Design a protein around this ligand. Structure first.
Ligand SMILES: Nc1ncnc2c1ncn2[C@@H]1O[C@H](COP(=O)(O)CP(=O)(O)O)[C@@H](O)[C@H]1O
Ligand SMILES: Nc1ncnc2c1ncn2[C@@H]1O[C@H](COP(=O)(O)CP(=O)(O)O)[C@@H](O)[C@H]1O
Ligand SMILES: [Ca+2]
Ligand SMILES: [Ca+2]
Ligand SMILES: [Cl-]
Ligand SMILES: [Cl-]
Ligand SMILES: [Zn+2]
Ligand SMILES: [Zn+2]
Ligand SMILES: [Zn+2]
Ligand SMILES: [Zn+2]
Lengths: 524, 524
């Protein structure tokens, strides 16, 4: 039998350094997790112990801390090379700085193949980018060869900045003839590695004949067999087994996000490449694993340039600033309240003619909030802390909407509630109540809004046929996260200030902050 | 028949200048009201027209604007003398600066008699204060004589600073032998003039044999016959007729507060002093009455010293700051929210050890909020604006209370709801719901409070047997407004910063404020 060890990461999102266990900045060093130094130690240990090992990344290394703000992906190429990754698939965040921001820092510097079979280049772009990413790579592993075929979320154009000259084809349609090619080349072991989300991963496993294993990402899925070692709750066993339409058992794996875990799957193949068995579990990268001293020293080197985003205290928090996805995608979270209060404040700083100009209302996609902040380091808030919460460089815009437009937005907010999706709205100037037992599109059972046409602001039931001034991310003003109604029906859009500056100025002005969860969003 | 015209004011509370119609600072001059210049014009007009006129004040001239903060009652004596008042009764606020603060600025300078029959001086004080206020005064009016007997709220010791050497006797008990004396002196026309509240006024009219008319104050009662001319809603006709136990019809009058109206009652007497008939109505002192130019010039003179409390803008509001009694004694008012938010802020500026130190909760007697602020003057907030909202020089203290102590405080808050009484609580860190259809002591149907023993603050049901850190006025920490439970049961009291400084520093820090009514207090 020939045994393959697959070690995999996904949605690392610029956590080059170890982190608190909620993936924010490490403060209590003795209990930190993740980071590429600790990852290295563990991979090294596994490579000593197992003869056939591949280390794979399923995309979304780009975007998430000051590391990326500053080094713009040059840190990704540098440290992925140091860890000796064997292959990476392109994720949507790889395109955030446009194709140019992927070509120059990453594709031209990586020492391993970068993959995606469903991304097709056209127009003036097709010539530059040719050869820089590949549909697949066949890799020698010991005496054998393993084919890796890449794929990338078909909805990257609605998520990132890939430009007008790249086409994202259906993953299953694009993947099949590549896997078919590999088979005619007599490659009988085939891993599909890519970045479309666990639901698409399962369908690729089901539908692409010849795929032996799927290694995926994008949905930050945590899978586990046995008693999970930390706060993440398993969505299924590890590996998750899909039975293909031609009858094969196909393991499907993902390993959460932020470099907190290393996925580890061992696959037993026979000499024809049939999977006899597989097993494993993600490995929690906690402090019981030591940080490699070489990689850590090189991280400390690179870190020097990052220190002046932590040089100044902006303000303090005396409460935990809960920007976790498990809160912000599911209920009112105090990081979302703080941000909306800054957006409204920033506006109502230049307002009042009367009953108009006053904008009283804010909404904010909870998935746009990308990290918590911890109150325990004497509670200091720095530019670096804020940059991990708001890494996209968006702006907070003013939009005018109808009551009816807004009610449909709130129905959209919870239309598929329960899947940790980013559309769930955090708010200010708005008291919404949902009843999730009702049907999608009919779950909003109360929606009050803060009058602006009044001398004392108080909450009144929203009116379907009235018009309202809402502050919200440009992401949302453009129909991001499926808020088609907003793009389609707004009656006015104006651009606003940079997101991080807004929140930063607000914090500096308050000096000490303490946002509560206060019943702006309730469930019936 | 001999016809007497009684012109009366009560609870003027240092509104020497004309005011907006909500009794705050005059900004729109063409629509201002009240003030002693306008009052003078009207009284002058009446004195030309009627031969037998008395101008009477039923107490509480002291305390309410920068006028009093600064001139400490010397302005009261000066302008009451200019208006030629015939008599004043002592009210509770006359004692706010202690007996010394009444003796020196007012009792020694007034050109008219100052009255109270139920205030008895004892100890070392009895000798100083003798002769400076009187139980009654007989006044020549044309060819006749009218006896005026004074009275003062028996609860002045729980309201003001009268010291340990003055006794406040039952008003009816003290009044009867004085009225009896006047009768044996053949005074057959007798006005009881005093400051105990409309309910006590009615009982004096009922029970003190020989009183022909009661002129009162303290409860700011507005009475009117016909269609009221402004926003105040009549509590009864003017005069309000009480039938005495010996069968006489006794008119009882009051004229709201803040010098907005001049009470005007004409009484027809026969030659034995029987009241044949009476009628009148309070006169709204609006801009249709011109300000007397002499008095106005002398007001402008005195005003010069007040100008440097308006020299600096503290901050702006872009909302009306509703500190009216009709709001703050009856529902959540945004001036009460602003004040509690300043109290909590001022504390949580020097806080965090963890789950303790953090004080999350504030309560505030709505009657301690003594004026609104208008947003229309480009919304400027000055020291003078704030001084009329918080004129008492109190402090905001920290107290530790049991859940059970707090629940009884909230029941106390609404135990006699509906009478514009000052105990109704404004709050922060607290979401209370009342059901006024339930019995007194059982009207609180929800009471949630902001955790402090948690890393993210959120609202949880109060627990009867838990302990809570509450910021509140010292007035309340001492059992003011009938909050006996608080004084009696608190488990810790510490003194805090001056009230006006707290709110002022808060406003200066926010720069621009916009407090909403947001459902901290709801009714079921
Ligand atoms: N450019 C952008 N601006 C604002 N929010 C964004 C964004 N890109 C992604 N998001 C938010 O993040 C959510 C998706 O984050 P996930 O972690 O589940 C997948 P990924 O963004 O890392 O590709 C989106 O639903 C949206 O709410
Ligand atoms: N020294 C003090 N400190 C704080 N609040 C006071 C106060 N004196 C009076 N109040 C508040 O004002 C309410 C009474 O005001 P009213 O206008 O009805 C009668 P008056 O205070 O002018 O004598 C009290 O119930 C209390 O809430
Ligand atoms: Ca195979
Ligand atoms: Ca009589
Ligand atoms: Cl998915
Ligand atoms: Cl009364
Ligand atoms: Zn991601
Ligand atoms: Zn992604
Ligand atoms: Zn008064
Ligand atoms: Zn009074």
């Amino acid at each position: 039998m020939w045994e393959l060890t697959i070690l995999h990461t996904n949605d690392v999102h610029s956590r080059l350094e170890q982190t608190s266990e909620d993936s924010s900045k490490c403060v209590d060093a003795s209990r930190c997790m993740g980071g590429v130094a600790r990852l290295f130690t563990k991979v090294q240990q596994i490579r000593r112990a197992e003869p056939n090992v591949l280390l794979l990344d399923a995309g979304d290394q780009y975007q998430g801390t000051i590391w990326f703000t500053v080094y713009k992906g040059a840190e990704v190429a540098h440290f992925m090379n140091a860890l000796r990754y064997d292959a990476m698939a392109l994720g949507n965040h790889e395109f955030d700085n446009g194709v140019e921001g992927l070509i120059e820092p990453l594709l031209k510097e990586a020492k391993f193949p970068i993959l995606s079979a469903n991304i097709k280049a056209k127009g003036p772009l097709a010539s530059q980018i040719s050869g820089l990413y590949l549909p697949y790579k066949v890799l020698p592993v010991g005496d054998e060869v393993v084919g890796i075929v890449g794929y990338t979320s078909k909805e990257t154009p609605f998520l990132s900045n890939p430009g007008t000259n790249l086409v994202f084809e259906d993953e299953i349609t694009a993947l099949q003839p590549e896997v078919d090619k590999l088979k005619t080349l007599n490659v009988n072991k085939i891993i599909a590695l890519g970045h479309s989300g666990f639901e698409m991963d399962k369908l690729i496993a089901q539908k692409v004949r010849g795929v032996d294993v799927v290694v995926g990402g994008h949905s930050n899925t945590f899978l586990y067999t046995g008693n999970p070692p930390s706060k993440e709750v398993p969505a299924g066993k590890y590996p998750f087994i899909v039975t293909s339409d031609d009858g094969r058992k196909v393991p499907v794996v993902q390993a959460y996000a932020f470099g907190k875990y290393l996925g580890y799957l061992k696959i037993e193949f026979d000499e024809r490449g049939n999977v006899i068995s597989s097993h494993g579990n993600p490995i929690l990268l906690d402090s019981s694993i030591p940080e490699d001293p070489s990689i850590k020293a090189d991280i400390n080197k690179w870190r020097i340039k990052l220190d002046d985003y932590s040089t100044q205290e902006l303000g303090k928090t005396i409460v935990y600033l809960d920007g976790s996805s498990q809160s912000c995608r599911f209920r009112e979270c105090n990081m979302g309240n703080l941000i909306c209060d800054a957006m409204i404040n920033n506006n109502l700083r230049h307002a009042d003619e009367m009953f108009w100009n006053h904008v009283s209302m804010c909404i904010l996609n909870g998935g746009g909030i990308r990290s918590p902040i911890d109150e325990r380091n004497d509670g200091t808030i720095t530019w670096e802390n804020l940059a991990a919460v708001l890494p996209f460089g968006g702006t907070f815009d003013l939009v005018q909407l109808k009551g009816s437009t807004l009610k449909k937005a709130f129905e959209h907010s919870v239309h598929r509630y329960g899947q940790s999706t980013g559309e769930f709205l955090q708010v200010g100037g708005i008291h919404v109540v949902y009843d999730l037992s009702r049907k999608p599109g009919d779950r909003v059972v109360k929606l009050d809004v803060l009058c602006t046409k009044c001398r004392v602001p108080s909450y009144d039931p929203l009116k379907m046929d009235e018009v309202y001034k809402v502050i919200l991310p440009n992401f949302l003003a453009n129909g991001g996260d499926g808020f088609q109604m907003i793009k389609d029906e707004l009656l006015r859009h104006d651009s606003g200030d940079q997101d991080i500056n807004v929140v930063s100025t607000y914090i500096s002005k308050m000096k000490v902050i303490y946002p509560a969860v206060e019943g702006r969003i309730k469930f019936s």
